[PDB]
Amino acid sequence: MSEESQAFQRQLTALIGYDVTDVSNVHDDELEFTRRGLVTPRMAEVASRDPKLYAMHPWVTSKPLPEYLWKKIANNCIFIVIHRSTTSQTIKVSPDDTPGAILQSFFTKMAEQDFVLRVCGRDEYLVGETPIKNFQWVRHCLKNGEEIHVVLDTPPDPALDEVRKEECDRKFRVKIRGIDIPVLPRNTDLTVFVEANIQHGQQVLCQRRTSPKPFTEEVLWNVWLEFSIKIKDLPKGALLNLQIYCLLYYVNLLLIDHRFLLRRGEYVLHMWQISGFNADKLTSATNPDKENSMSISILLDNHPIARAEMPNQLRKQLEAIIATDPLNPLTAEDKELLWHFRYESLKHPKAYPKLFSSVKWGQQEIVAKTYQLLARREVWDQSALDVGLTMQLLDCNFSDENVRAIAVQKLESLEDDDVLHYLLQLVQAVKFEPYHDSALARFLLKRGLRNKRIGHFLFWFLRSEIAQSRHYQQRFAVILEAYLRGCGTAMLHDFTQQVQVIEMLQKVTLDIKSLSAEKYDVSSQVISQLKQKLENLQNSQLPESFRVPYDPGLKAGALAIEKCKVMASKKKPLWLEFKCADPTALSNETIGIIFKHGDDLRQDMLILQILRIMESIWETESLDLCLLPYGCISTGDKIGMIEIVKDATTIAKIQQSTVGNTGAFKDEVLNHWLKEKSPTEEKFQAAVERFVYSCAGYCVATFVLGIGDRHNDNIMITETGNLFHIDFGHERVPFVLTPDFLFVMGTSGKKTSPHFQKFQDICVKAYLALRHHTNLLIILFSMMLMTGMPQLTSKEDIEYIRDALTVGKNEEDAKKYFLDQIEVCRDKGWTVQFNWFLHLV
Numbered sequence: 015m016s017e018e019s020q021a022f023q024r025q026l027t028a029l030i031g032y033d034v035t036d037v038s039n040v041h042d043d044e045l046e047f048t049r050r051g052l053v054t055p056r057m058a059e060v061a062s063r064d065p066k067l068y069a070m071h072p073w074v075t076s077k078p079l080p081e082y083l084w085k086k087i088a089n090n091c092i093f094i095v096i097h098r099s100t101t102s103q104t105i106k107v108s109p110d111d112t113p114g115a116i117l118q119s120f121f122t123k124m125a126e127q128d129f130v131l132r133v134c135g136r137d138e139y140l141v142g143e144t145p146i147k148n149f150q151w152v153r154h155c156l157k158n159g160e161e162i163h164v165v166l167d168t169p170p171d172p173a174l175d176e177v178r179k180e181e182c183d184r185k186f187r188v189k190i191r192g193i194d195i196p197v198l199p200r201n202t203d204l205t206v207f208v209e210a211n212i213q214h215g216q217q218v219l220c221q222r223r224t225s226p227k228p229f230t231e232e233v234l235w236n237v238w239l240e241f242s243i244k245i246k247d248l249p250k251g252a253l254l255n256l257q258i259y260c261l262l263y264y265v266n267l268l269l270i271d272h273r274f275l276l277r278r279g280e281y282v283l284h285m286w287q288i289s290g291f292n293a294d295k296l297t298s299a300t301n302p303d304k305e306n307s308m309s310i311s312i313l314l315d316n317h318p319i320a321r322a323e324m325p326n327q328l329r330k331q332l333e334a335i336i337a338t339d340p341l342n343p344l345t346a347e348d349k350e351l352l353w354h355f356r357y358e359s360l361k362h363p364k365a366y367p368k369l370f371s372s373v374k375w376g377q378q379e380i381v382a383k384t385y386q387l388l389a390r391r392e393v394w395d396q397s398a399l400d401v402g403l404t405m406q407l408l409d410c411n412f413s414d415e416n417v418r419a420i421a422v423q424k425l426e427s428l429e430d431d432d433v434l435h436y437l438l439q440l441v442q443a444v445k446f447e448p449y450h451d452s453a454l455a456r457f458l459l460k461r462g463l464r465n466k467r468i469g470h471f472l473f474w475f476l477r478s479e480i481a482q483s484r485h486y487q488q489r490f491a492v493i494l495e496a497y498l499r500g501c502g503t504a505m506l507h508d509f510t511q512q513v514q515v516i517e518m519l520q521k522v523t524l525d526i527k528s529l530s531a532e533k534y535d536v537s538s539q540v541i542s543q544l545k546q547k548l549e550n551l552q553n554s555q556l557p558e559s560f561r562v563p564y565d566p567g568l569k570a571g572a573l574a575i576e577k578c579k580v581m582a583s584k585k586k587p588l589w590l591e592f593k594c595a596d597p598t599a600l601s602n603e604t605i606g607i608i609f610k611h612g613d614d615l616r617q618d619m620l621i622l623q624i625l626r627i628m629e630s631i632w633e634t635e636s637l638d639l640c641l642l643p644y645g646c647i648s649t650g651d652k653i654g655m656i657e658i659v660k661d662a663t664t665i666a667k668i669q670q671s672t673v674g675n676t677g678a679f680k681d682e683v684l685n686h687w688l689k690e691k692s693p694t695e696e697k698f699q700a701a702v703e704r705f706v707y708s709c710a711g712y713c714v715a716t717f718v719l720g721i722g723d724r725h726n727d728n729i730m731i732t733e734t735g736n737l738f739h740i741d742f743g744h745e746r747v748p749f750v751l752t753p754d755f756l757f758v759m760g761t762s763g764k765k766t767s768p769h770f771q772k773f774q775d776i777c778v779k780a781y782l783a784l785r786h787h788t789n790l791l792i793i794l795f796s797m798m799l800m801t802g803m804p805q806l807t808s809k810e811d812i813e814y815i816r817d818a819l820t821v822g823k824n825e826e827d828a829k830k831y832f833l834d835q836i837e838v839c840r841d842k843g844w845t846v847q848f849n850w851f852l853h854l855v
């Protein structure tokens with residue numbers, strides 16, 4: 015290789031937080047073969063990407079402007095403001111104008127075309143052949159009541175992104191030699207057996223078992239388990255799933271390797287324990303912790319695969335099946351129907367998930383007939399993209415690489431606006447791929463390299479998992495490495511800054527927990543020991559500036575040490591604030607970040623992202639619900655950072671105005687708080703209007719996701735009336751709509767009023783609107799549960815959102831469901847709010 019060529023890889027390992035050149039936890043070479051496989055997709059995308067547009071990463075959309083934003087234009091005229099050091103004139107522009115065209119109405123409007131419209135304060139450019147109506151920064155300014163401000167400077171040089179020179183009819187059988195574990199002790203001794211499953215997409219094709227034996231630290235069976243399934247009938251992607259019950263341990267082994275070879279030989283597999291169903295149960299990875307983990311020893315010595323029209327009455331039976339939801343389980347009668355009428359079923363794209371579930375993958379002939387099916391894919395290829403539908407073929411139920419490829423094909427048609435909407439959920443879906451190299455993993459690689467913004471979030475989503483998941487770190491590390499070798503040195507330098515900063519601060523956060531008590535208050539000497547520590551970093555240690563990971567436009571600078579503090583709260587997070595490093599920023603307002611170690615933030619990532627998806631859904635139907643899905647990024651193990659929404663206050667704090675007598679509660683208080691922070695009465699009604707939309711948006715969203723029973727303490731409001739929920743780490747109430755909220759709506763329980771009439775109207779509007787996307791939400795939820803929780807009932811915890819979205823019912827009933835829910839909160843008032851307290855003391 016080379017002296018400095020290996021110094022490149024030690025930079026790569028530092029950003030990844032894992033060494034992909036390590037081979038100490040492999041029993042084959044799939045991971046290294048995947049490093050080599052991804053060189054091509056990388057070099058292709060890099061080689062065909064526009065240098066100019068890659069440097070500026072214009073964030074842009076082809077969707078129509080919503081109805082709720084053409085109301086803020088009674089005149090077909092939008093206001094932009096071009097800047098230059100001191101002075102800065104304003105310019106009349108029509109929504110359909112272009113970056114180039116408004117430069118035509120600036121220079122010629124004055125009485126050399128190699129300048130650019132960058133945004134004031136950020137690294138966000140208005141460029142490329144798009145209308146300004148169709149730029150995200152512009153839609154954002156219109157949405158808030160802000161005015162588009164812009165500075166004129168030289169385009170950033172493409173030179174800075176340049177990339178370095180790169181680098182049988184025999185039945186199947188397995189011998190169970192035995193198991194071994196250095197130490198087991200609990201208290202009393204039991205018996206133990208090994209269960210072997212041939213598995214394919216959460217379908218057990220076959221299952222044999224050992225005789226049981228006593229659970230000493232070594233147990234030897236020496237037994238052949240003859241299976242019924244024949245070798246030729248083994249499908250690519252099938253897993254030998256070895257499990258130990260007395261269900262304490264599990265491990266998996268792909269029966270057909272990444273070169274289509276039948277798996278053969280002597281394996282010692284180090285196994286995962288079960289924490290006192292989910293995506294960790296599917297992994298081909300073995301436990302790296304070889305000193306403590308349980309190990310199984312096996313032997314393979316077994317290569318391969320090298321007219322008439324329906325009666326109208328069955329069609330109805332078949333259509334009914336196809337209509338049902340992604341969780342509605344299929345009977346044997348239903349599957350056989352689907353399969354017998356394959357070709358009719360292929361005419362309905364929505365039937366696809368249900369159809370490929372009806373396939374007997376445990377049979378060679380039928381899989382082949384299934385490949386004949388996928389070969390005449392005219393209707394699918396021509397169908398309009400359905401993200402819900404496409405996602406379903408990427409979940410844990412589908413292990414066939416061709417099935418999964420027809421789904422990835424549909425994704426290729428997404429523009430970058432929609433990729434960012436689904437990116438986190440597509441990164442989690444790499445967990446369900448049988449092989450490390452996959453159409454999906456490559457699709458992300460390709461989309462990330464093509465767009466600096468997708469690239470940026472693909473970095474942190476990958477790194478979040480690598481840091482806190484032994485089950486999938488090696489796979490994701492290989493994928494990240496591939497990204498980093500093609501993202502270009504501007505982005506590598508950027509990440510290196512970001513990784514350095516957060517490593518310095520997490521250090522400070524862990525070092526501060528320990529000097530404070532397990533829990534009480536915040537010491538005089540502890541705010542002493544926070545300021546001192548950050549003064550030492552600030553000088554010769556911290557970058558002059560780093561990219562804010564949750565908002566990669568914004569460049570944070572030097573710390574505002576006076577405003578930083580440890581938080582009198584759960585597990586001593588740091589409230590930090592930074593100066594903005596861009597001197598053309600039009601405000602002296604700091605960037606606020608919380609650093610927390612203790613909670614599990616991947617869950618918050620996931621919930622906030624589904625919340626961003628609901629906003630986008632409501633966009634399809636002219637519905638704005640003023641949600642504040644604030645930034646939130648997991649960076650490492652049980653730890654990460656959070657955006658501080660400026661001017662926000664906990665609802666429980668507004669109730670603790672005085673005393674707050676261990677849980678005193680009072681209807682009228684919220685409304686008084688709103689008038690104090692609103693210098694004109696005019697802005698006060700703007701706040702109540704904002705509170706009715708926001709309260710409604712967070713009510714509907716929260717009912718649907720089953721996270722609505724919350725303390726006042728985890729709900730906030732801005733000075734401008736924008737309500738929002740926080741801290742999604744996990745008698746009853748479907749959601750929070752307490753008497754304090756209702757007095758803002760001019761209604762003190764058991765009445766109706768103009769502002770409350772809006773609230774109900776908006777709620778049912780929002781609720782029926784999410785139901786036009788029932789299959790999407792069910793599948794995102796089901797996946798959320800599987801890749802981002804503890805262990806969970808693959809039927810029962812998902813089955814909440816069915817009943818929440820009132821599946822199978824007509825629209826009138828559905829409204830009547832939700833409207834009962836509102837009146838459950840108003841029939842209970844404070845009962846549950848007060849109840850959180852009763853346990854405590």
Ligand SMILES: CS(=O)(=O)N1CCN(Cc2cc3nc(-c4cccc5[nH]ncc45)nc(N4CCOCC4)c3s2)CC1
Nearest residue numbers: 581582583613618644656657658659662664740741742
């Ligand atoms: C005297 S004190 O300085 O200690 N004071 C006490 C009362 N605090 C109220 C808050 C608690 C809080 N927790 C979180 C959080 C905690 C853990 C996990 C989380 N996931 N998402 C948020 C979040 N995120 C917060 N946000 C997010 C949105 O932007 C405003 C700050 C706030 S604000 C402020 C601090």
